[PDB]
């Protein structure tokens, strides 16, 4: 997640660990698709409420922008008004060449095409066929 969001979590971690009853948060996050069952089992395995909260936050710190939002929403939805307020200012913005293209092809797979190039279609098409 964005550094703003992550630092907001880090700043308020102790408050969050003291109060969060994970059983009312993990459900939402699982429903939303941003927490896995195995993470939840790892959380459940901690013996005390604060230890579970601590584990869950550990996990969340490593997740993406959507996850932070999932977490925040669940907090708000479950009546943790004060805790959500702490996390409010840290909420991150969420949600031919296309997304796919720069997604997969930035893996080192290709050097970027030059600054100036004419397009030779006739050959490229052939290569695509073969």
């Amino acid at each position: 997640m964005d550094a703003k969001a992550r630092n907001c979590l880090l700043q308020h971690r102790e408050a969050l660990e003291k109060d969060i009853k994970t059983s009312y948060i993990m459900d939402h996050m699982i429903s939303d698709g941003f927490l896995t069952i195995s993470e939840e089992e790892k959380v459940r395995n901690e013996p005390t409420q604060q230890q579970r909260a601590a584990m869950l936050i550990k996990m969340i710190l490593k997740k993406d922008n959507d996850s932070y939002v999932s977490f925040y929403n669940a907090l708000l939805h479950e009546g943790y008004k004060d805790l959500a307020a702490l996390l409010h200012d840290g909420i991150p913005v969420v949600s031919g060449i296309t997304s796919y293209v720069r997604t997969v092809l930035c893996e080192g797979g290709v050097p970027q095409r030059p600054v100036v190039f004419v397009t030779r279609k006739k050959l490229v098409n052939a290569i695509q066929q073969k």
Binding site: S23, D27, H28, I30, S31, G33, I37
Partner: protein, 95 residues
């Protein structure tokens, strides 16, 4: 249980644990051999023993009960008058 059915059970987690009535469901589950009796006693004691905690453990444990666990579970819902919940489930499976 295939991955799609499992995924369905996770997606519907909130609704299932919010709405599932369990006390009336055990007979149905037995009839269709979804759970052994001791398994049921264990689920009944899950967490605090509230309806929600039982429900949650039920649906988690459900994922392990076979290839047809999900459709059989929908049927038990139907059989016990939980048509609304069964309906929410089915329209997803199909979706």
């Amino acid at each position: 249980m295939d991955e799609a059915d499992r995924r369905l059970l996770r997606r519907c987690r909130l609704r299932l644990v919010e709405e599932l009535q369990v006390d009336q469901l055990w007979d149905a589950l037995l009839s269709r051999e979804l759970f052994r009796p001791h398994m049921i006693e264990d689920i009944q004691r899950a967490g605090s023993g509230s309806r929600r905690d039982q429900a949650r453990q039920l649906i988690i444990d459900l994922e392990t009960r076979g290839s047809q666990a999900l459709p059989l579970f929908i049927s038990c819902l139907e059989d016990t008058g939980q048509d609304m919940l069964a309906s929410f489930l089915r329209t997803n499976r199909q979706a």
